[PDB]
Every structure is written in structure tokens, then in C-alpha cells.
Design a protein around this ligand. Structure first.
Ligand code: ADN
Ligand code: ADN
Ligand code: CA
Ligand code: CA
Lengths: 364, 366
């Protein structure tokens, strides 16, 4: 409704947004069954992509959570996007509900959007992933440059759920769209569980993130399970980020590791002791080395745009959200057909804490 | 300190009136406008709160940065802080928070001879109480094999904020024969000083001691503390059951202590800390899961002794009022020799509910 708007406005939740010629309202936060990242435009609403619960125990989780067989899809380690067509143009929305200047700039490189020309009702939900994205430092192990897009669900304008698995696969085959791997359809029987475990071991051995389970049912329930490798890397990856993150971030990922060790047994999981230790220590050691050398703690990011304008709009966008973290452009040079952007995320508080500690300071 | 500072903190809820052992008093629940937490205002005097000691993370550069004069090095004993004083013909013991501790107050006559207060009624004795049978802390120093023991490390004075000097302190302890924290000696941040202090921490660490407190031999009498990696590790482990009640920097903070020691000492010779840091998190939590599977609750058991039954009951009632989300649950209150033996559980309800939710295949949104 519009009174829903009123309440969400006055109490911050929703915000007006001005970008790409457009004016619209964006729920910066989840509120009374309207999900985060729902975006109210003039002609329509692109609903927020709902949260997928995590299970920590594979067997007991699959058994408790699901009422029917379920599809097992790869969880690709990138960032969520929802793509749609508005007028004769195409827009990519981040999870937070902003129009992504990188993704939108790059759509024609990443995906054939004929599907939207012929089906303008659809919202394509896709993971964008690769070593040269502006949001995350990790990449799937099979993407070694630039970024790739992987469709994983279809939604519709002004509609909250998802096209059945079979309609999703129908549109992916018909329009030859790039997509997340379908591992198959399983159940939580002893035979299903054993095969899913075999998948997760392979995923772990190859550095893949995990899987998303999708119920073959009207309700179409989802859940995700993440490998120990990915949970470890999240710890490591976030060393420089420690002051910005709730403690919960870490005790949640510790629990994930510990519950896997409980599920599979200590004998087969001893190695995680050292590796958990290295996930914390090695990233922090790397933060200290960097501070000795550069007097700054930061991550460097690199990525490519068709248009100079969009690289600048990305630096702007990262700047509005991020705080105590300086987004500092390093380079923007035309390299062939693209503009190559290099920028640093500077962690000002970690920078001040390490310099204070290293110089012999006191902390309470 | 004055009347309208106290009036505003009663309104802002930094101070609260308590009553205990026949005494009615005002208690500083938090820091407020430089009045340290634990400050207790009695009608006849103020017992100032024990002030915060800062932590250095780099032993050599910290000592060199923080101190301008020589400094005494004392053992940091891992127990709980107590402030002990005379009122009328009675003696009382305050927790760091400023409550009159029914356990510590009950056991004063077994813990320490208080002739010193009789002869010097202005003194406040600052001591650590430590041992395996105390109600605040599961951990024990290794050299207290049972019950509890008390170790003086400072004197304060009624109505005053500072500390008796080292000399003055060492004289009172020698005169009245008080139990005291080990004194390592008087040092400077020179090359030689630093070599000796590092040998001391290496030894303590190998002996499982907590660390040391450094105390400037001067008027400003600046203090600083440094913790062994062993104690830092053990804190992470013994706090597993406690993880949902974690302040906004247990991670960044206890890990940085270990990481900066590794950096100071070299990462070649400190590699075993990887596995040890992993074990600290993983084995504490694994044990809380084993305990949950066995007893269907996640809890720590505490055991301690009183001269008076009313005091054990008063202790239970004190612990229920702090601890929310933590259930205090008596197991045993029984005569044992000339003492009432108390055993009780702190049940962590949130850890208990979370592990139950996850272990039966629950979903967590985040
Ligand atoms: N196959 C997949 N199905 C659903 N979500 C996925 C998949 N791969 C990666 N993801 C990401 O995981 C997140 C879980 O909410 C989604 O926002 C999405 O961006
Ligand atoms: N020798 C010592 N000097 C000062 N504080 C000590 C000592 N040993 C243990 N402690 C405890 O360590 C805490 C440091 O904040 C103090 O509140 C005190 O309870
Ligand atoms: Ca990851
Ligand atoms: Ca300890």
C-alpha cells in the first residue's frame, strides 16, 4: 500500500533513489513481509529476492526442512543480481536494491537479453562472479578472468515467488542462457544423503562454495548448505574487515565448521583445527605486513566497463554504503574496448588500530 | 564527586542504591564522567572503584612507549577482583561491580588476617581471589589446588582515588604478613630489562600463568598489563558456552593479542599457535555439543564453601540478578565439616536453545 510507504519512510526503512535517469523507492531494510531490496518504480515493483535459510547439519537438515524431493543447484560465490527491462533499456539491481552501475553497464557482455524483449514480465535472478568484480574479492575456481553471470531463478514483475524448476529450465534451454549447475533431483533418504555428501566432498576438494536445495512443491522451500572450505575462506577473507563486522559473523561461521565436524566425526576432520587457526591468523598477519609497508590497510579491486560514466557511478555507490572504509580510485584508463578501473577499499579503523598497537599503544 | 553528579546518574541509571549485610549504599553500575564503575558510596565514606588497566599487545615497544620511569613487574593472577574494608567492627568485600560479595565477605577470616584494617581503618585492600572452588570463574591458577586463596596487589584509601606507592605497599604486606601477588622486581625498558622481562613471560607462559601487571614507580603511577598466549587461548576455550553473550570485539581483540605476539616473536617459531587457536574455538564448542547431547542443557557447574548458610543463599540470589539469559540453578547445599558446601549451575539458555535448533536440523537466516 501507500501507508506502508509512509511508515517505512518516516522510520528510515524505505528511501527514494535517483539513478540512471530514474526515480524510485528502495527498501534499504526488511520490513513486515516486504523483503529488503524490493524496488518500487513508477510502472512496477521488482520484489526483493527472499532470504534462503542455512542448515548446519546436512542429514538432519534435509530431513527436517523438506517435504518432497528437491533440486540440488551449485551455489556460486559472487553477488546476487536481478535484471529487468524498463522501456527500451535494461537494469541490474543489487540485493540491496540499488541499480548496479557495473552489472548494468556490462549486461550485453554477460547475457543475451532477448528473453526480456520477448518476455518483459520476467526478472532474471543471477549470480555474477569472477576475479574482477567490484564487490567481493573471491572468485569461483573455474572463472579466471573478468566476470561471468549464472542464472539461478526467474521472478516476475509485481510477483513474489519463482517459476517452477521446470519452467526455469524451459526458459534456460530455449534461450541458451548461462546458469548454475543442476546436480539433480534428490531426497533425504539414505541413498540421497550419501550422494549429496559425495557432491559436497568434491565441491570442497575443488574450492566450490556449496549448494542450494529447492523443493519440488507449490511452496518451493529453499535452503543452502556451505562447504567448510568456503566458511574458512570467509573468515580469512574478512581479516582486514574485523572491526566492521559483528562478533556474530565469526561465531556463526565457527559453529558451521564445528557442526560439520560433529556431523562427519573428528577423525575425518582434524585438519580443520590448523586451518581455522590459519584463517584468522594469516589474514591478520597479512594486514600487519601491509601496514608496515604502506601505512594503510586495504584491498585492491579491479574491473572493466563499457563506459567511463559507469565506472564513476560505481565508485560513488560503493562510497555511499561503505563507512569508515575509504573507496579510493587508483586508475581509470581506456584499455582496448573497455575502461579499466582499479580502486582500493581502505579500512581506516583497522589502519588506526594496527598503527596504534604496533607503536606500543594501550587499549582497554 | 558531588550531589548533582550522583543525582544525574540516578536519573541516567549509572548509579543504584543497594542494600546488603545491613548496609544501604549507592553503587556505580557503569563508568560515569570519570567515576569508575564499582564505586560505592557509603554514608561515612566512599570506596572508589578499581580503575581500568590498559593492555599492551607488543611487549618491547609497549614498555618502551608507555613508561618514563622504572617499573615494578607483578604477577597477574587469574581470579576475581576484590576490595576489602572495615566499617564499624565488621569487614566487607566488594566485587568489581561494587556489590558486597556474600561469598568473599563470608570467607574473609579464612582468606586474610584483617588486623591491618583494625590498625589502619582508612585502608582498602585490593586483592585477587582465586581457586578452583569459587563461584565466579571456572578457571584456577595452577598453584591453588583447592578452595580459594587471596592475593593482595594494591591498597587504596577510603575517599581517595589513587594507590599507595610500591614501597608503602611492600611495607604493609611485610608488616602484617599478607598473602601477595609474586613480585618479579623493578625494571627499565632497556635492552637488559627487556631481555629479562621476556624471559619472565616465556616462563610464565610455559607455567600456565596469566601474565603480569607493570606499575610505574612514580607519582602518576601508570599501569599496564600483558597476557600470555596460553591464557589468551584458554580464555577463548573456556568461553565457548558463553559465545552468544560476546562483546563487540572479543574476536578482533583476543586474536590480535595472539597475532601480535606471533609477530613480535616471529612466525617461524610460533607456528603451533595455528592448531592451538583452532582447538581453542573448536574443542570448547565440541564439548558444549557433547554436553548438550548428554544432558540436554548447556551449563557450567560451580562449587564453593561457606561458613554461613544465609551467605550461600545470598550468593545464589546475587547471581540471578546479574546473569540474565543465564539461569542460576542450585544443585547441592549441604553441611560439610564446619562449612556449608554449595554447588550450582549456570545454564546458558540461548546456547542451549541454539544448539537444540541446529542439531535437530533447524534453519538459520543469516
Ligand atoms: N544456485 C543458486 N540458487 C540460489 N542462490 C544462489 C545460487 N548460487 C548463488 N546464489 C546466491 O546465494 C544467495 C542466498 O540467498 C543468493 O542471494 C544468491 O545471490
Ligand atoms: N598483580 C596485579 N595487579 C593489579 N591487578 C591484578 C593483579 N593480579 C590480578 N589482577 C586483576 O587483573 C585485573 C586487571 O584489570 C584487575 O582488576 C585485578 O582484579
Ligand atoms: Ca566465500
Ligand atoms: Ca584466563
Amino acid at each position: 500500500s501507500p501507508e506502508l510507504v509512509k511508515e517505512a519512510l518516516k522510520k528510515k526503512k524505505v528511501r527514494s533513489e535517483e539513478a540512471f535517469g530514474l526515480e524510485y523507492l528502495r527498501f534499504n531494510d526488511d520490513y513486515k513481509d516486504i523483503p529488503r531490496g524490493t524496488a518500487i518504480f513508477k510502472d512496477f515493483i521488482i520484489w526483493g529476492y527472499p532470504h534462503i535459510g542455512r542448515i548446519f547439519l546436512l542429514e538432519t537438515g534435509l530431513r527436517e526442512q523438506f517435504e518432497a524431493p528437491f533440486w540440488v543447484e551449485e551455489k556460486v560465490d559472487g553477488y546476487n543480481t536481478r535484471i529487468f527491462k524498463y522501456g527500451d533499456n535494461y537494469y541490474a539491481l543489487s540485493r540491496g536494491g540499488f541499480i548496479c552501475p557495473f552489472t548494468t553497464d556490462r549486461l550485453p557482455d554477460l547475457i543475451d537479453l532477448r528473453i526480456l524483449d520477448e518476455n518483459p514480465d520476467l526478472v532474471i535472478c543471477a549470480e555474477v562472479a569472477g576475479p574482477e568484480n567490484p564487490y567481493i574479492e573471491e572468485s569461483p575456481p573455474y572463472v579466471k578472468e573478468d566476470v561471468q553471470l549464472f542464472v539461478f531463478d526467474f521472478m516476475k514483475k509485481n510477483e513474489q515467488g519463482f517459476l517452477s524448476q521446470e519452467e526455469k529450465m524451459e526458459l534456460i534451454e530455449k534461450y541458451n542462457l548461462p546458469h548454475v549447475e543442476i546436480l539433480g533431483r534428490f531426497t533425504a533418504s539414505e541413498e540421497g544423503i550419501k550422494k549429496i555428501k559425495e557432491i559436497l566432498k568434491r565441491f570442497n576438494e575443488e574450492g566450490r562454495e556449496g549448494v542450494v536445495f529447492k523443493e519440488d512443491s507449490e511452496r518451493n522451500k529453499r535452503a543452502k548448505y556451505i562447504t567448510s572450505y568456503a566458511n574458512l575462506m570467509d573468515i580469512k577473507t574478512n581479516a582486514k574487515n574485523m572491526l566492521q563486522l559483528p562478533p556474530e559473523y565469526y561465531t556463526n561461521r565457527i559453529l558451521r565448521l564445528v557442526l560439520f565436524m560433529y556431523e562427519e566425526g573428528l577423525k575425518t576432520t582434524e585438519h580443520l583445527y590448523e586451518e581455522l587457526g590459519r584463517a584468522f591468523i594469516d589474514g591478520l598477519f597479512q594486514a600487519i605486513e601491509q601496514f608496515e609497508k604502506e601505512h594503510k590497510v586495504y584491498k585492491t579491486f579491479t574491473c572493466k566497463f563499457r563506459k567511463k560514466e559507469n565506472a564513476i557511478a560505481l565508485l560513488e555507490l560503493l562510497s555511499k554504503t561503505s563507512k569508515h572504509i575509504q573507496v579510493k580510485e587508483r586508475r581509470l584508463e581506456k584499455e582496448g574496448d573497455y575502461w579499466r578501473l582499479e580502486f582500493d577499499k581502505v579500512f581506516l579503523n583497522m589502519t588506526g588500530l594496527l598503527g596504534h598497537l604496533l607503536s606500543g599503544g594501550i587499549v582497554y
